[PDB]
């Protein structure tokens, strides 16, 4: 997708 | 009259199922509609597929009217904002699981 | 493609849905079936129709293998219980909007 | 319905 795997 | 539109509600019921499925949640939107807040050159053919599991994105907030949340390109933190008038479909990355939405008159 | 059906998920969106556009929500549960427990004595033709709205309705707990609540019948409250694999559709009375569940793998 | 309309 677009966006990372983690929001962390 | 017509009622209002059932995209959000299936939407979040899929987003849910598949959750209990373990498969992970991907959206596809249409950018080239009128309110779409994401980074464009992100983008591709007029769409682009997002990220919404529970790790991957902040505050995530599936409302009737749209679909908002934090996620990061790049790395870069940034908002996000769709509305349900763009989502085009939602599945699971693992295995394809999912539906794409029928059209509603609500949403032109 | 073996993983958990969509029916109790699609029913709680339609629930919704309806309860949200200002409608009542009826069911149609399949009598036949076992592991229903209902005041047979309605059932018209191997069919039981159910109003699982609000007002009608004491603690609905809409579960992913069967609905359950308390709803009086006759004028005397008693216990229900539907295998969501005995359920046949949700719609509005009102104007019949709604749908059909269709047939899953899972429930047989 | 089979029920009553409230389980008031």
Redesign the interface.
């Known amino acids: 997708?677009?966006?990372?795997?983690?929001?962390? | 009259s017509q009622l209002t539109p059932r995209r959000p509600y299936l939407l979040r019921a899929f987003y849910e199922w598949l959750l209990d499925n373990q498969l992970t949640p991907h959206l596809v939107v249409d950018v080239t509609l009128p309110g779409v807040q994401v980074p464009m050159e992100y983008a591709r053919d007029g769409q682009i597929v997002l990220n919404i599991a529970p790790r991957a994105v902040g505050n995530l907030e599936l409302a009737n009217d749209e679909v908002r949340f934090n996620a990061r390109f790049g790395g870069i933190p940034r908002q996000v904002s769709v509305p349900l008038a763009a989502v085009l479909a939602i599945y699971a990355r693992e295995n394809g699981a999912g539906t794409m939405f029928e059209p509603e008159a609500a949403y032109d």
């Open positions: 997708a677009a966006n990372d795997e983690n929001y962390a």
